[PDB]
Amino acid sequence: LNLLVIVVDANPIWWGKQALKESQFTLSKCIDAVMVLGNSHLFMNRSNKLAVIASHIQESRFLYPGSKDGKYELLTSANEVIVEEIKDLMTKSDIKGQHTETLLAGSLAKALCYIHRMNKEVKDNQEMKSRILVIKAAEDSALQYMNFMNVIFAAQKQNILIDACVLDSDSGLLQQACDITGGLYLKVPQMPSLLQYLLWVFLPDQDQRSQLILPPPVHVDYRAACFCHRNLIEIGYVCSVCLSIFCNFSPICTTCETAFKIS
Amino acid sequence: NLQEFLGGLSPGVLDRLYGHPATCLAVFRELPSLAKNWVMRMLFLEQPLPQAAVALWVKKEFSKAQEESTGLLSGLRIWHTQLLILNPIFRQNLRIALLGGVPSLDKYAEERWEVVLHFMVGSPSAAVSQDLAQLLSQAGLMKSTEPGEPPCITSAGFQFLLLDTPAQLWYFMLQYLQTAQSRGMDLVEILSFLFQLSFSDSLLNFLQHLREFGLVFQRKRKSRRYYPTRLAINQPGFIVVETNYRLYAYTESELQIALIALFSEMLYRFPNMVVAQVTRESVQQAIASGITAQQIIHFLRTRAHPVMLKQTPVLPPTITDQIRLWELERDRLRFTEGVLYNQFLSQVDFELLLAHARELGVLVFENSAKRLMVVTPAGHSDVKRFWKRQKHSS
Amino acid sequence: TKVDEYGAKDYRLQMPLKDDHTSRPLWVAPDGHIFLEAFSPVYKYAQDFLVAIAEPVCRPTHVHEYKLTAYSLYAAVSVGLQTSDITEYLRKLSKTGVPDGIMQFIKLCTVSYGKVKLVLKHNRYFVESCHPDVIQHLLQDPVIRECRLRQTVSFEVKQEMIEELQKRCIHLEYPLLAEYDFRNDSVNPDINIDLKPTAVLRPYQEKSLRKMFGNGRARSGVIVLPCGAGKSLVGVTAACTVRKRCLVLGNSAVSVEQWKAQFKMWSTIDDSQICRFTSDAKDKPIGCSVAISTYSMLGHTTKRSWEAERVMEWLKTQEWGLMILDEVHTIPAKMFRRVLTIVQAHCKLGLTATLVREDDKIVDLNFLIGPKLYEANWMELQNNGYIAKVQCAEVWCPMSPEFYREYVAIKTKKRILLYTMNPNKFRACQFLIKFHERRNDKIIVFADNVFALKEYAIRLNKPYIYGPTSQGERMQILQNFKHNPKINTIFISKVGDTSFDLPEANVLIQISSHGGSRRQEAQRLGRVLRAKKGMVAEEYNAFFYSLVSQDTQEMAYSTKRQRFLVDQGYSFKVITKLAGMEEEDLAFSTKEEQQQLLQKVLAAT
Numbered sequence A: 001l002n003l004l005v006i007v008v009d010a011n012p013i014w015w016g017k018q019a020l021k022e023s024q025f026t027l028s029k030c031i032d033a034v035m036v037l038g039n040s041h042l043f044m045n046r047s048n049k050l051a052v053i054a055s056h057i058q059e060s061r062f063l064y065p066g067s068k069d070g071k072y073e074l075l076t077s078a079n080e081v082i083v084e085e086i087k088d089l090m091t092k093s094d095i096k097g098q099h100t101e102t103l104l105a106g107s108l109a110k111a112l113c114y115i116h117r118m119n120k121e122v123k124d125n126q127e128m129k130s131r132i133l134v135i136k137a138a139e140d141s142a143l144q145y146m147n148f149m150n151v152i153f154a155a156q157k158q159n160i161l162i163d164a165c166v167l168d169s170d171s172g173l174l175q176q177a178c179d180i181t182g183g184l185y186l187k188v189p190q191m192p193s194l195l196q197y198l199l200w201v202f203l204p205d206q207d208q209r210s211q212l213i214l215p216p217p218v219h220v221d222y223r224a225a226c227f228c229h230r231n232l233i234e235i236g237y238v239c240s241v242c243l244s245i246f247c248n249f250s251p252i253c254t255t256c257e258t259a260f261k262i263s
Numbered sequence B: 001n002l003q004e005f006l007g008g009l010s011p012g013v014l015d016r017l018y019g020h021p022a023t024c025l026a027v028f029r030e031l032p033s034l035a036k037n038w039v040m041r042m043l044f045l046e047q048p049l050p051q052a053a054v055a056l057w058v059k060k061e062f063s064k065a066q067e068e069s070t071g072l073l074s075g076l077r078i079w080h081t082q083l084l085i086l087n088p089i090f091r092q093n094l095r096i097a098l099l100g101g102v103p104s105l106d107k108y109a110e111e112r113w114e115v116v117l118h119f120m121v122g123s124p125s126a127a128v129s130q131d132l133a134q135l136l137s138q139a140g141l142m143k144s145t146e147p148g149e150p151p152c153i154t155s156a157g158f159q160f161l162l163l164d165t166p167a168q169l170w171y172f173m174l175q176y177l178q179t180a181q182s183r184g185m186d187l188v189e190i191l192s193f194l195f196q197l198s199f200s201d202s203l204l205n206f207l208q209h210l211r212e213f214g215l216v217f218q219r220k221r222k223s224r225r226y227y228p229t230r231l232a233i234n235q236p237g238f239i240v241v242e243t244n245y246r247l248y249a250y251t252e253s254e255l256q257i258a259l260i261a262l263f264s265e266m267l268y269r270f271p272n273m274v275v276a277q278v279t280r281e282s283v284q285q286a287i288a289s290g291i292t293a294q295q296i297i298h299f300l301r302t303r304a305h306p307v308m309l310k311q312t313p314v315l316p317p318t319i320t321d322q323i324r325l326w327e328l329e330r331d332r333l334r335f336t337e338g339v340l341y342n343q344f345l346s347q348v349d350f351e352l353l354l355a356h357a358r359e360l361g362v363l364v365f366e367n368s369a370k371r372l373m374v375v376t377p378a379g380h381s382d383v384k385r386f387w388k389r390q391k392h393s394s
Numbered sequence C: 001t002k003v004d005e006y007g008a009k010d011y012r013l014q015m016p017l018k019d020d021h022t023s024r025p026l027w028v029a030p031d032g033h034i035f036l037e038a039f040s041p042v043y044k045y046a047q048d049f050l051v052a053i054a055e056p057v058c059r060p061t062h063v064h065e066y067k068l069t070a071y072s073l074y075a076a077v078s079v080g081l082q083t084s085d086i087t088e089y090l091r092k093l094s095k096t097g098v099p100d101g102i103m104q105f106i107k108l109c110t111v112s113y114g115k116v117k118l119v120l121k122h123n124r125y126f127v128e129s130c131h132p133d134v135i136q137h138l139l140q141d142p143v144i145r146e147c148r149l150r151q152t153v154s155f156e157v158k159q160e161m162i163e164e165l166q167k168r169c170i171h172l173e174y175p176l177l178a179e180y181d182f183r184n185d186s187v188n189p190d191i192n193i194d195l196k197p198t199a200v201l202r203p204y205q206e207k208s209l210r211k212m213f214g215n216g217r218a219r220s221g222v223i224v225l226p227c228g229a230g231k232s233l234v235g236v237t238a239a240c241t242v243r244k245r246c247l248v249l250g251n252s253a254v255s256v257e258q259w260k261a262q263f264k265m266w267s268t269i270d271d272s273q274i275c276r277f278t279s280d281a282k283d284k285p286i287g288c289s290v291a292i293s294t295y296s297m298l299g300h301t302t303k304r305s306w307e308a309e310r311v312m313e314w315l316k317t318q319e320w321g322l323m324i325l326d327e328v329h330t331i332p333a334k335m336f337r338r339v340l341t342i343v344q345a346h347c348k349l350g351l352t353a354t355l356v357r358e359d360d361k362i363v364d365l366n367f368l369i370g371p372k373l374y375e376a377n378w379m380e381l382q383n384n385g386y387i388a389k390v391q392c393a394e395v396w397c398p399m400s401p402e403f404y405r406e407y408v409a410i411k412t413k414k415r416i417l418l419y420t421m422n423p424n425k426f427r428a429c430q431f432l433i434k435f436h437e438r439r440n441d442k443i444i445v446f447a448d449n450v451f452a453l454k455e456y457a458i459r460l461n462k463p464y465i466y467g468p469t470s471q472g473e474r475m476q477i478l479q480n481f482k483h484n485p486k487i488n489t490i491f492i493s494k495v496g497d498t499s500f501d502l503p504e505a506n507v508l509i510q511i512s513s514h515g516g517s518r519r520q521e522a523q524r525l526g527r528v529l530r531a532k533k534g535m536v537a538e539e540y541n542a543f544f545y546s547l548v549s550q551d552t553q554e555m556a557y558s559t560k561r562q563r564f565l566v567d568q569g570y571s572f573k574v575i576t577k578l579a580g581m582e583e584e585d586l587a588f589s590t591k592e593e594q595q596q597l598l599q600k601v602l603a604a605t
């Protein structure tokens, strides 16, 4: 079976900027597209299961743990729960000017441990191939690099595919993230037609992904820079403690304070 | 299989059968691997697309999956070339199906199927039902020929009996549908209920027959609501086989003992065990009745006690080979009808006459060294005329 | 007594089922048949108890089959198991109770034991009995009076009629006791025989000896052990323990030679103290005590030579502490059984490996020698490695068309020479022997028909042994087979199965069979059971081939012959065709060669 997790980056600052701009695309339509994708994923098979996470500057919250209109009861419950919870989360939110960048990585960690919990609980008879369909919507924060890299490596070890679906911006950190675990990277330039991209590129599971034509991966610039002025460097002088990429040979690296002996 | 059953249908019945509630989902689940995704893809498109795109939308490796899926779904007629947009009706129904718009039961099903099999075999005590009896008789696995005397069991009956419960029930329901069309019950309406289970007068009669088979049980004096059993949606062994053709079966239900006695000689019957011997007499008796060694071997393997599961193969090679050899020794001599002409004189002229009886299908065996050909009396009036024509041609 | 709708002896209303049936792994049928589970955790204890009280008839890998009888129950009482001591544990082990029929049978058999005892003293056989009523009501029939020579009441009985009286008592329900109190016996001084520490006794040998030695007294009985299990060693150990004059009886020259070799190898007794009472060669039989001889010589009915007459008179006059008889399955024969009465012995131990025969004379052994003390488990020995694992196989050879034509056409019995010699099986044995010869596997070909054996042996220029085969030439051929690498095959006749000291062989092909006899089949199979120095059970190093001819009475003979082996558990794999036979060049391929062979067979007459 397959356990899909949709990590939606519903950043109020950026989505409300879109709302003020009165652009055609809106967070409501984005949520509807994600809902349709999840419904189709479960539609694929009974054993398949899904979950949803929404990201905010403060924290990240799960959007998912009759036939009034003649509809599959389970998908109806999914629609109702996600709609109600997303509206509640968006309606209620404190204001903090100091922190405005979206905390995308923190949710990833929640997704990973949730997948681990589900893998533990599920019977050993059936093998579960989990996936994380990250949908970024705003620029990433520099300060989150370390933790995001930790979670990416944890996902690599635990065999989960991070399929990035960045839109309106190309996050180098996120493309690097999905490249490590082999997840697909699609940058949709036509936001109104986003759902067609999901039902082709992302929706097919890892089982059938190899035996299918999908957009080629984007080249990844694995840049390195010294800790002084933040710029690309091809040669780094790291020590045996900090393991920090530096500018030039120095008597002692500041982040270490070690008694380096010249030679 | 259900894929065969649905493939053997016309477009007119197919589109009607694609009902809104369940059919669009039950037939979807059939889609083995990839057709699920392509259909999902083009569930939201109102514009047909070229076939070349679908052709090139699968890598060079594992293309046979692409062709087989495309052929299967073309047979199902989910889309039309229109020049590959899906059928509008199926698209709408599928969108409505995708965000749009027990312990006693299993025992009951087991007991009902067991009593049905008891009646199928010559059990003096069994459930009595004229409709069930006539349905089984017309299913092709039973023939009576005398209403007063209880019906006997035909050759196909034993083969059906020795099948496993899942395949047995599935074939029984397939025959039920085929005979439903003959008796006049609408096929589409009854078929849709089976798909709806895994999630009118004709409906009531069909549900009554299903309840008689034990797949469903209203439990409320035949109320509208029903609670399907496990078998409606669609175990450890007990026989121990020795190397001396001896079977020790931990059987308490008389059905298993009867099934074993069908092809073995019973020796002792303990309260929780029974001893039988697989001898030439019993095995050849079963083979003459109609069974073949494959069914017996499969039956013994599926009902294999856990003790003998450790050894590989589970069933001893000596027992398996002996059963197969016993079945093979059954047939030798033959039977056919024919007439022989001779003196074919010219060698090149006899070769032309051999093609006349071979095309019509009346040639049995020939001989180019002695100029002899055997012709069945069914086509004797056509070969002689041809020979006369050849003679006239000279 | 109750028959189900099938051949099913119904026992639903006969006996109940124990609630803890899963815990109890034992079954008890009213007829006495018992079915033990080889997978139960208490299987070893159940096996020991059931072997003690019953004799195996079928011991496959999963479910062993035993049946108990009067003789087995008498043996249990002899080893000292009382009626309660056996029945209480039988009920405890049984998962379905004990039928009243078996209960009463056990009670009667146990109580009817020990009342009548037979003790020979001063060359006089007295029928002692502490209870006098047994004799009082046993003297009803006149046969006892005419038999008898013309508390603790005893009367002398005639020497010649001992066998008749014993078989009469067996059905009279008063078995005689043949226990020997060698611990308390001053009439015959003990012999200076001891068992050297070099001899090693295997666990099954020790168990059989323990069954044989119930107490200080040496019990006379039959111990069935596989030929490769070391029955010769067991017999030598028994003689050494007895420490009195021992007379071992073989069945042939090879048997006597092997017995002398075993005596010298395993016993410290000097060479001069062992004699071979054999016509071919003798070592002053009167000079020494420990003797090895043959049934034919001792029971010889025609005129006796002067020296043999003197030796026979000396043997008759002397009394023997132990009388070992190998291959007891031949004892009930007329001449062979006459030897029992001809010679005098306190305890006559019997050793063999195939205690089975068609005529119902095996039961006579129970009184001729004694109850069957032990039967070794061939499968357990194979698992323990004491006996080489054998991949028993039956190669089916399709009969050639012409040969089948004459075979079916003639209603006479030239078929024995015909189907034994057909191109398909002649090519088969040749190809099999070639394949094993290039594999460095030792071959022992077998064939009942001496004519066919000689023809095959001359065609394959191999050293066939059979019939007259001088003893010197026999020994030379056996030595060459054992030592010379250039030769690795010997073609032995029926004499091989009688009693042969032969080196372990990797394969055993049998081109012809005497009949559907389970004795000959097991006897010949026992040759390859000799465990190798460092082999493994799963390697299947040992192979047994029983070549048969398709669509012939030989098929019936082979099926009527593999019953005992399949009962033990060996699975005979059928081989319709052999790979590489077509490519390998063999005789009788073209039609012409088969034609000349058929012409020779027809001219054989």
Ligand SMILES: [Zn+2]
Binding pocket: A226, A227, A228, A229, A246, A247, A248
């Ligand atoms: Zn720098």
Ligand SMILES: [Zn+2]
Binding pocket: A239, A240, A241, A242, A243, A253, A255, A256, A257, A258
């Ligand atoms: Zn440092």
